[PDB]
Amino acid sequence: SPGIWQLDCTHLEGKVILVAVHVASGYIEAEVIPAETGQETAYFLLKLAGRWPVKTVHTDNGSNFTSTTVKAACWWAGIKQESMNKELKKIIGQVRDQAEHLKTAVQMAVFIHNHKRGYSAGERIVDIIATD
Amino acid sequence: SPGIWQLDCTHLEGKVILVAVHVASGYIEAEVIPAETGQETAYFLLKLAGRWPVKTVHTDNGSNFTSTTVKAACWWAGIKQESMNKELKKIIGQVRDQAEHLKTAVQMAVFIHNHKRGYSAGERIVDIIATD
Ligand SMILES: Cc1nc2c(c(C)c(C)n2Cc2cnn(C)c2)c(-c2ccc(Cl)cc2)c1[C@H](OC(C)(C)C)C(=O)O
Ligand SMILES: Cc1nc2c(c(C)c(C)n2Cc2cnn(C)c2)c(-c2ccc(Cl)cc2)c1[C@H](OC(C)(C)C)C(=O)O
């Protein structure tokens, strides 16, 4: 289904990477957040929902979504409740030297992942959303 | 052309909002940045390029792109060099009370703008990129 996203946090260099995967296409949005808090998840959800038709959200840690602030963001954006962290960490390690900050390398790995091809993840998400 | 984005900063509450507009569709990405620096523009460009096919970038302030760090981000993402800030500020003011932080209100205004309809800005950008 075109509106299903999976959201999770992973850890690297003592920092937290919030990874959102459009399940139907494998397309990734990811950001380095200062702490693994409900406020950061709520804000990230608001950002994501403004850029993509986010209908339902899955996670591998259901307690991520128990926050009063997270439920309000979902409420406001009309969101209901519905590996890749290894692939993203692999690309991060490949490009890790190309940048000082981990957050820069994360965006590089997101770029590479979404455009790597026989279409790419970025190519088939816009097709999925367009046809639907 | 589907790869043309316009990037600018605007000011509100002593803070800086970086606004990127997909010119062909009117679709907006916007973030609150701590300062109007080349590093923040470079990082924002890296984020944008990983999510959309960014080919060329325009701006209303050409000195935004003179930074050595900005030119490197463009170089790495394959980017070449090619109102709405009033409409975004208007929506921000409408939803300004719904949130404490300006950055939250910005994302709300982005959400509203991209999904307001007779298609919406978010709808026609994915169509433009899909057909192309
Ligand atoms: C912190 C930083 N400083 C930078 C650059 C660059 C290219 C230069 C010249 N400088 C100044 C410098 C470096 N060494 N010296 C002695 C001076 C980059 C960078 C790295 C890769 C890309 Cl594609 C684009 C920019 C970054 C990146 O941070 C962002 C937030 C992305 C700006 C990062 O995380 O590496
Ligand atoms: C800072 C903040 N705290 C919040 C919320 C909510 C809903 C609650 C309950 N709290 C705790 C609270 C508030 N008052 N009291 C006494 C305790 C929100 C919020 C506002 C709008 C949406 Cl859709 C979603 C969340 C935010 C937003 O920040 C982000 C970064 C988005 C979390 C913001 O900028 O308002």
Residue numbers in the entry:
A (entry chain A), B (entry chain A): 57 to 138, 153 to 187, 193 to 207
Task: Paste lines from the article.
HIV-1 integrase (IN) catalyzes the integration of viral DNA into host chromosomes, and IN is one of the major anti-viral targets. During viral integration, HIV-1 hijacks a host transcription regulator protein, LEDGF/p75, which preferentially directs integration into active transcription units. Small molecule inhibitors that target the V-shaped pocket at the IN catalytic core domain (CCD) dimer interface where LEDGF/p75 binds have been designed. Specifically, ALLINIs induce aberrant IN multimerization and interfere with its binding to the viral RNA genome.
Next, we determined the X-ray structure of the HIV-1 IN catalytic core domain (CCD) (F185H) in complex with STP0404 at 2.2 Å resolution. STP0404 binds to the V-shaped pocket formed by two interacting CCD subunits, which is also the principal binding site for LEDGF/p75. Superposition of the STP0404 structure with prior quinoline based BI-D and pyridine based KF-116 bound structures revealed that STP0404 maintains many of the critical interactions of the ALLINI family. The carboxylic acid moiety of STP0404 is engaged in a bi-dentate hydrogen bonding interaction with the backbone amides of E170 and H171 of subunit 2 of the CCD dimer with an additional hydrogen bonding interaction with the protonated Nδ of H171. The hydroxyl group of T174 and the protonated Nδ of H171 also interact with the ether oxygen of the tert-butoxy moiety of STP0404. The chloro-phenyl group extends up into the hydrophobic pocket, which is capped by W132 of subunit 1. The pyrazole moiety of the compound extends out from the core of the compound and does not directly interact with the CCD dimer. However, there could be important interactions between this group and the C-terminal domain (CTD) in the context of a full-length IN as seen with other ALLINIs. While A128 lies in close proximity to the pyrrolopyridine ring of STP0404, its substitution with bulkier and polar Thr is likely to create steric hindrance for the inhibitor. Y99 lies deep inside the V-shaped pocket, and our X-ray crystal structure of the IN-STP0404 complex failed to reveal a direct contact between STP0404 and Y99.
